[PDB]
Amino acid sequence: PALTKSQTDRLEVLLNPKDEISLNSGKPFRELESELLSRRKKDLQQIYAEERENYLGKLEREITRFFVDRGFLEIKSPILIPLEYIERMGIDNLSKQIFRVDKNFCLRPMLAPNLANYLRKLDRALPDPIKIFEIGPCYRKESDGKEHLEEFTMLNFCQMGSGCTRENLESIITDFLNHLGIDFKIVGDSCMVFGDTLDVMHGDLELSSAVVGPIPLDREWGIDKPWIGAGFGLERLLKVKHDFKNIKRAARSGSYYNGISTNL
């Protein structure tokens, strides 16, 4: 009773992290499949009877309450953005990761350009310091794998004016991940766009890159004050919280609901 690769793939789709079932136990495929189908139908029936909230939707709402309560303004900006923003962030023709739309547009690969525009504009009207955040879809063409999606969901929070120090940035990151119950460490890294970053790690998984400005790119966006900011992937936070093996369990998907296969 050896399982084919097709049979193992079907069982892995139906397996969830809390199961203490092994696919190599010697039981035939028909019994492993029947048992896992029964467990997952039960799981989906319980969600329909008692919860009915989507994991990505529910986490966005929880994060939104956290930042609104700490004084950050909730932003919802365009997902379809000018291709020119890509040139101005300095992603010089990484640029291969961009989804193009028609002649002059693209799907945004990050939230920073739209939020830079909001920091600049709101500094003319609001008292110091300016505190804002956005949650929503972002897009990158990626090598397939366990920690990257082509369509994912970003949180970016940022602050401009007073209080924009490394120690305050680390304190907000720490209060945020303590609220979610997720352990982490900070390591130094760097990238083209922003220079040196403080990367927020859970083991070898990058949850966030964060930046303490000013940086030379600021003049291109009309930013002329100290600032701090961090970008987090929500599907990666869900992967840690629910111990998913593959980040697809967490994604916008017709193939999983709250980590449960929809092929039942």
Ligand X SMILES: N[C@@H](CCCCNC(=O)O[C@@H]1/C=C/CCCCC1)C(=O)O
Partner that binds at residue 86, options K ion, ligand X, ligand ATP, none, CB closer than 5 to 8 Å by kind: none
**With contact defined as beta carbons under 8 Å apart, do 86 and 106 qualify?**
yes
Query: CB of residue 209 vs Mg ion: minimum separation in angstroms?
Result: 3
Which one of residues 209, 234, 244, 251 is an interface residue with Mg ion (CB under 5 A)?
209
The answer for residues whose C-beta is within 8 angstroms of residue 87's C-beta and 6 or more apart is 93
Mapping DSSP to helix (H, G, I), strand (E, B) and coil, where does residue 224 land?
Answer: coil
Name residue, tokens 């997720």: 182
Which one of residues 85, 152, 227, 244 is an interface residue with ligand X (CB under 6 A)?
227
- Site stretch for ligand ATP (CB under 6 A), options 43-51, 127-135, 142-150, 172-180: 142-150
Query: CB of residue 158 vs a copy of itself: minimum separation in angstroms?
Result: 15
Q: Which residue is nearest to ligand ATP (CB)?
A: 233
Mapping DSSP to helix (H, G, I), strand (E, B) and coil, where does residue 117 land?
Answer: helix
Q: Which among 107, 146, 127, 134 is positioned nearest to 240, based on CA atoms? A: 146
Partner that binds at residue 152, options ligand ATP, a copy of itself, Mg ion, none, CB closer than 5 to 8 Å by kind: ligand ATP
Which one of residues 229, 247, 249, 250 is an interface residue with ligand X (CB under 6 A)?
229
Helix (H) or strand (E) holding 67: helix 55-69
Task: Give me the amino acid identity at 116.
Answer: A
Nearer to ligand X, 211 or 240 (CB): 211
| Cα radius of gyration rounded to whole Å, the chain | 21
Nearer to K ion, 34 or 190 (CB): 34
The answer for residues whose C-beta is within 8 angstroms of residue 229's C-beta and 6 or more apart is 112, 115, 156, 157, 158, 159, 210, 211, 213
Nearer to K ion, 14 or 158 (CB): 14
Residues binding a copy of itself (CB under 8 A): 40-41, 44-45, 47-48, 52-54, 56-57, 61, 64, 68, 71-80, 99-102, 107, 114, 117-118, 121-122, 124-127, 137, 139, 150-151, 252-254, 257, 262-264
CA distance readout (Å), 164 to 129, 161, 209: 9, 6, 16
Total residues in contact with ligand ATP, by rule CB under 6 A: 15
Residue 129 near ligand X by CB under 6 A: no
The β-bridge relationship of strands 130-139 and 73-75 is parallel
CA distance readout (Å), 166 to 77, 90, 197: 27, 24, 11
Q: Residues in the site for Mg ion, rule: CB under 5 A?
A: 206, 209
Q: Residues in the site for ligand X, rule: CB under 6 A?
A: 110, 112, 115-116, 119, 154, 156, 158, 194, 209, 211, 213, 217-218, 221, 223, 227, 229-231
